[PDB]
Amino acid sequence: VQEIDLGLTCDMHVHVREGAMCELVTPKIRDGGVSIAYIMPNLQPPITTLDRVIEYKKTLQKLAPKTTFLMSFYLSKDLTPDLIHEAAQQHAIRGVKCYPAGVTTNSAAGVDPNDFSAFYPIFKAMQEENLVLNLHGEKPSVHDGDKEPIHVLNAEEAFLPALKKLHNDFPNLKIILEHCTSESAIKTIEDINKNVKKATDVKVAATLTAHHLFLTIDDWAGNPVNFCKPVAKLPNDKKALVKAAVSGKPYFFFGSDSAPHPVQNKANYEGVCAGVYSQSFAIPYIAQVFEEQNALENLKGFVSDFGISFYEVKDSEVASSDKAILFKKEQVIPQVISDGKDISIIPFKAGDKLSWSVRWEPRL
Amino acid sequence: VQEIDLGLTCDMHVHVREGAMCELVTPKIRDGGVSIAYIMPNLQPPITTLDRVIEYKKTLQKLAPKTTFLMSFYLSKDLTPDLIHEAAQQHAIRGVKCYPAGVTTNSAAGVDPNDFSAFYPIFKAMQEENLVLNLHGEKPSVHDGDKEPIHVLNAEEAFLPALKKLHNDFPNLKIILEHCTSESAIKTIEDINKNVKKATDVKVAATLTAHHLFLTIDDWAGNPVNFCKPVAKLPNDKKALVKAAVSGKPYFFFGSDSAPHPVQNKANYEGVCAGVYSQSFAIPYIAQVFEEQNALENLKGFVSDFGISFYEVKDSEVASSDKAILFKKEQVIPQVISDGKDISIIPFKAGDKLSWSVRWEPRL
């Protein structure tokens, strides 16, 4: 079987939830072929306190002893600059994730984004402390006047001006447009990094999920199991993300947005929960695209190199120095992922064949 | 004003199924304020023979005597121009309805819209007998990658060329573009009727549903109840359909497309059935749209006159010359339409209030 060494792999957008769900999915981070995981904080309630995030990281480290965990705060009106500084100095967090209110699950009441000026004290303190501003780029939907009607298809593109203002008001702050879905957003990321030579110049990057390199609007319309925010869009949008994923540019790297929901949460007739679960076969999904694209020698940077560089992951904090190795062994995706009790999750592309699997090799 | 005499109301797109479902639904045609209802032909199996269409027509009449029924054939390959003449002369069918294969419910027995040519002998006979060609304007999806992509959002615009073909080759065959959903579809019907004013001149018309005058993509994104085919598109498309509804022009009239499924066919995690139920409150729905647009002087034309003028409904067939009186009593839409036995339906706008009601009054 043909194999590739990938080193310390990166998933900079992981949802892992609480409770018995968190105990089922957290070990599957390693099973997906991921050594370093950036944990998003949209919990119930959102993680806004310094106590919470210290307790939470140890819960994950008890669950996954070999996986590196970069934590984050939920951007709320609760946070104050001192809390940013004390948490950053204790290595409690690595960034703060911003949720526009009413545009995804666990996000209300979060922030108003045709604004952001209210949180400039926080961005001041994050900029000083080298933290990362993760943005769920989506303007909340307003349909009437005065301005343009905003819907699930232009919500990401309508947000882009606000991302441009933030990069100008805080040029030295690290910002990420999380999970890109539209070609207009891709063009904006390239344009912001127009002059950039070598990766350490990148201050504004974009992450790309596994499922948005596969899905279009047709795959989720009438299929709540492919429903997520931001919505998978037109075929030309998908072509852009796939082109961007294989491009080998240092401002696009992997972030699954693996968001587990029990199957009863997805089989509603109103109010379907949003989020696709890709944790269990994370890198095997991505290697499938790159093989299909005949660009495998760029995969090493998309799932490992470009992300460590951006988040400045030093060897010292990494929980284990084992490498993730793909090997071309064909496997079939289960119908369900389940704890054998109350929680059963439907995996992305369930019942399909993948060319690669993942094992782990120590360092010598 | 409160109380408006509507006369003989027209719903030129009604789904009633069979079995225990039909016994809950066909009484609600009357309940919704509809006296004349066109019945669609997609059953298990599709309605294609004179035996079934007449026995269907007869079971309908035992379950709702006062309702006038206009019946239809499924456009299947098991059809002959002989079968057209032997059903048109024996006053059994008012038209034949074209289903593209795979796009919607029970459409697996449908047709391939990239080549209508095999059915040209059928449309030749349908033109001879002054029958109505009901078209579900939607090309089936083509991921392709070579030729242009066809998806659920642009499938209606893709069908519009094929319709301007059918109108050139059968210039006297009465054709309807069923449930319009896009501004491209509306502009085309305006362009086809460049020079008509009143009213029997229209041979290519377009029917508009209740829910498509309400819904945008945001309303069915994570709400399977509001998922139907063709899908509800963008706010610029809804504005076009509303402007064309309170238009007062003869080529737009009412066709609810009330398609009922048992709620368990909606609360699926994949493969959710398509179709919204609106038969129980069909006329009060449209009444609220025509009220909120300050164009109630056009409700009678949209929901009665133009539909009668196109199908040329004669006095000699209407099952009950009772009049639909729309009176302004507030009513609340139930959570669940129920039969006390097995079948449970979720109605359109379930829970919401309506500004109007409708009762029945005989002519005297």
Ligand SMILES: [Zn+2]
């Ligand atoms: Zn998000």
Ligand SMILES: [Zn+2]
């Ligand atoms: Zn997320």
Ligand SMILES: [Zn+2]
């Ligand atoms: Zn249809």
Ligand SMILES: [Zn+2]
């Ligand atoms: Zn229909």
